[PDB]
């Protein structure tokens, strides 16, 4: 059931036709950007994981 | 990390001769320039105290 | 006079009960973030001290 399992993939990702698998192990993920903001009794601190 | 006028160490009136050729670069952000030209405007904001 | 001297501390800082002093010298300060913006006759330059 193609239309069922095709819906599970995320909206941003649309994969191409071919895939040359040449191993018994494949990592899959995404490269996201995190913008953290910290606050406590001592004070405030702002950072960013690129 | 600030400059007070009392660092001159001379009460009274005087005129200063600034050496513009021997301007060393100790700590450089992207803002940092060596050659100023005309009317210099610097606008800074301080946030995230801890 | 606790209420008088307690008011002098900055609004962001609220210190904890105990402090194990183990020397004859203590530095105290804050870690701030500076967002400088420069403009002169040559052009504009924008930086940030993190």
From Swiss-Prot, chain B:
Cellular localization per UniProt: Virion
Source superkingdom: Viruses
Role, per record: Capsid protein self-assembles to form an icosahedral capsid with a T=2 symmetry, about 40 nm in diameter, and consisting of 60 capsid proteins asymmetric dimers. The capsid encapsulates the genomic dsRNA and the polymerase and remains intact following cell entry to protect the dsRNA from degradation and to prevent unfavorable antiviral responses in the host cell during all the replication cycle of the virus. Nascent transcripts are transcribed within the structural confines of the virion and are extruded into the cytoplasm.
Family: Belongs to the totivirus major capsid protein family.
UniProt-recorded name of the protein: Major capsid protein
Protein's organism: Saccharomyces cerevisiae virus L-BC
Location of this fragment in the whole protein: 549 to 598 of 697
């Amino acid at each position: 059931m193609s239309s069922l399992l095709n819906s599970l993939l995320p909206e941003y990702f649309k994969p191409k036709t071919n895939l040359n698998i040449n191993s018994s192990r494949v990592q899959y993920g995404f490269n996201a950007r995190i913008d953290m903001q910290y606050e406590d009794d001592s004070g405030t601190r702002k950072g960013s994981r690129p | 990390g600030r400059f007070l006028y009392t660092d001159v160490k001379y009460e009274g009136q005087t005129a200063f001769l600034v050496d513009m050729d021997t301007v060393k670069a100790r700590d450089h952000c992207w803002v940092s320039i060596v050659d100023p030209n005309g009317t210099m405007n610097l606008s800074y904001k301080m946030t995230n105290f801890r």
